[PDB]
Design a protein around this ligand. Structure first.
Ligand SMILES: O=C(NCCc1ccccc1)Nc1ccc2[nH]ncc2c1
Ligand SMILES: O=C(NCCc1ccccc1)Nc1ccc2[nH]ncc2c1
Lengths: 397, 395
């Protein structure tokens, strides 16, 4: 078991999960150079000499390390207000990826600069067939970049829009979502907004969760307190809505509420609390005991209705509070084609037809930003706008 | 691939500025220079420090640090710091450790000289040069861990013995070979004196204290306007360089060898005066002020070599190359040859009681005074920036 301090330090340098690995320490240097190199700061001789020593090295370093220029932008497949996601191809290797851009200017300006660490951690390290993998994270003075596996299947909002979804399909996607969420919970995170938008389909048509921006690490009780609120309330549980008003802590069962809403949406065609205003939806959700209604059309399988109602319910009695096994045993999951352990080896309901490795047909097309880069006022003294981003770089090795 | 390959080369190279040691020094320097209450008003700064607090604590502990060594005794003081005989608490190995005050070096300026000192000792790989094993630092000091030279220096030797011409010939010869090794690396030493000449356990000589060294241009010269060295040994060219126009070559080290030889044989320095000023004046006036006692018993050839060293640079012995020094008649002898000189039996082989024996160094008080240093930034100063990259591990 014993290791010398020298061995320990050496492990720290090579460990991908370490904040002191080489790539992380390169960040520090790179950031310091960015933030010190202005004519006013250079009147300090300490700073001026430091930068003279290090600027040859720093320019060559910035040249060797991975950079935005290493990738061609094929098309824009998503937009998030801190930036966007682009289909890219690497120049040397020709491999195709999805690349997320995050704007350092906006994050600083809007003073939301800490939110992406969970998403980095999850996608880099989950090592699960249920989670979009992060291959490379890098940065320049303007953006953070995340190079992810491309998911040409597109998302579940698209699929629900192009198809009428039978119970057999719904059972399949629901089950894959149950397993994805359990993987995330097992990593110690609560997702906090689960919804069709966050569910991507791969080449074989099997689901993975993407977009981990709202995830939070559970404490030892398995609880979190939402930091950021979220956007649309449609898939959000009552206890999460209430906690937004300062009330308290919630646990992972908030994610299972969302699955309930999702199931309902696939089967019924609308979300169960839908309303043409935000406040109308918020109200329906709080009033869920009364507001939850099953449709005119059909009596859909009672097992389905039963599962949905088991999810949409106060947290103390909600399905999943006793763990994921009680969910997997629900009669709604009983079927011929697959078992829980073999689920991902099954042939999927919709397998995408793809003309090229570049085919975006499952994504709504977006033009381009074409807007212009804003810059901070020039430092009169050390400001350190790059400091929050030190340690972001990551290379799967 | 090839991009990824060069990168981890830069990360490994002991001479690379992006190597692991430098990268760690960067972060460590950054944290020291940011962590103050005024600076923590800034949220970027405050959040960065909270985020790295535990890791910085961890790293400071894992890396080589002062508490790893036990201080046996203080064996020298340079006003920019001191040298301590130390024992590594774990390996039990003994070393000489120099401490250089960051405060003093910033205060007095001259914060760049330790770079070449570190490099010469780390990479010389010469029997004539004290080896550096490790260099490290904390917020207060730079540390250099060097081989210990239990023989002590030439000053201690001269205080204990009358030095016969036979010994003087040996030590001057070793000094000549050592200086030449340094010139071949591309440096002028500039502070050559008995105090910087150390004897190993077998009584053979090494140079130490390279803090005054300067790299020669491709012409073999340096351009410098500041008198350096120590008053008894300073050459007229270096003394003159004060207030402008100094351009000079390696032969200033040769001048100092002549002072050394005179002092061994005569028993006084050739330019001695009761004041610095008298000494500087005698040195500028050297053509007139240099005398030997009447009626001395010193040999002509010894006096000839001394006079051939202490004269104006353009005619100085060594001007044309080291060979003309080695051929001088004073060195002619049947005991040793130049190529094997360091394999012979030294004149005085020290008698040592333990690996800890200090008997060849003057007792130096450990403190006996008070402690202090540092000012406090209300904006980022970067007082640690000039030291980033100093840390070194021989490996
Ligand atoms: O498209 C998105 N998000 C859309 C909006 C957005 C949100 C935050 C930041 C920027 C944009 N994500 C994504 C992730 C991995 C992927 N692999 N393949 C497609 C694909 C898409
Ligand atoms: O003791 C000194 N120098 C004294 C003066 C000084 C100058 C600048 C900064 C601090 C002190 N040097 C030294 C070097 C290697 C050594 N190995 N063994 C002894 C031994 C001594």
């Amino acid at each position: 078991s014993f290791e010398t301090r020298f061995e320990k330090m050496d492990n720290l340098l090579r460990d991908p999960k370490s904040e002191v690995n080489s790539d992380c320490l390169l960040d520090g240097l790179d950031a310091l150079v960015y933030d010190l190199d202005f004519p006013a700061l250079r009147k300090n001789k300490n700073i001026d000499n430091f930068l003279s020593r290090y600027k040859d090295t720093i320019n060559k370093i910035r040249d060797l390390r991975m950079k935005a220029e290493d990738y061609e932008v094929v098309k824009v497949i998503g937009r998030g207000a801190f930036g966007e996601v682009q289909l890219v191809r690497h120049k040397s290797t020709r491999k195709v990826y999805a690349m997320k851009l995050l704007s350092k200017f906006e994050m600083i300006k809007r003073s939301d600069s800490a939110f992406f660490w969970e998403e980095r951690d999850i996608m880099a390290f989950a090592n699960s067939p249920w989670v979009v993998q992060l291959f490379y994270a890098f940065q320049d003075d303007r953006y953070l970049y995340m190079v992810m596996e491309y998911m040409p299947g597109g998302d579940l909002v698209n699929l629900m829009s192009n198809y009428d979804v039978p119970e057999k399909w719904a059972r399949f996607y629901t089950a894959e979502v149950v397993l994805a969420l359990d993987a995330i919970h097992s990593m110690g995170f609560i997702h906090r907004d689960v919804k069709p938008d966050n569910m991507l389909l791969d080449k074989s048509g099997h689901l993975k969760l993407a977009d981990f921006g709202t995830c939070m690490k559970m404490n030892k009780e398995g609880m979190v307190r939402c930091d950021t609120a979220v956007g649309t309330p449609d898939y959000i549980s009552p206890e999460v809505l209430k906690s937004q008003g300062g009330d308290g802590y919630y646990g992972r069962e908030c994610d299972w509420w969302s699955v309930g809403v999702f199931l309902y949406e696939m089967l019924v065609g609308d979300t169960p609390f839908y309303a043409d205003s935000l406040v109308g939806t918020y109200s329906k959700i709080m009033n869920h005991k009364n507001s939850l209604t099953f449709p005119d059309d059909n009596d859909i399988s009672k097992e389905a209705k039963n599962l949905i109602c088991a999810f949409l319910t106060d947290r103390e009695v909600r399905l999943g509070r006793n763990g994921v096994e009680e969910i997997k045993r629900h009669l709604f999951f009983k079927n011929d084609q697959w078992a829980w352990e073999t689920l991902r080896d099954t042939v999927a309901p919709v397998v995408p037809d793809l003309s090229s490795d570049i085919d975006t047909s499952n994504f709504d097309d977006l033009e381009e930003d074409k807007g212009e880069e804003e810059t901070f006022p020039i430092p009169k003294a050390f400001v350190g706008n790059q400091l929050p981003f030190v340690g972001f770089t990551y290379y799967s090795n």
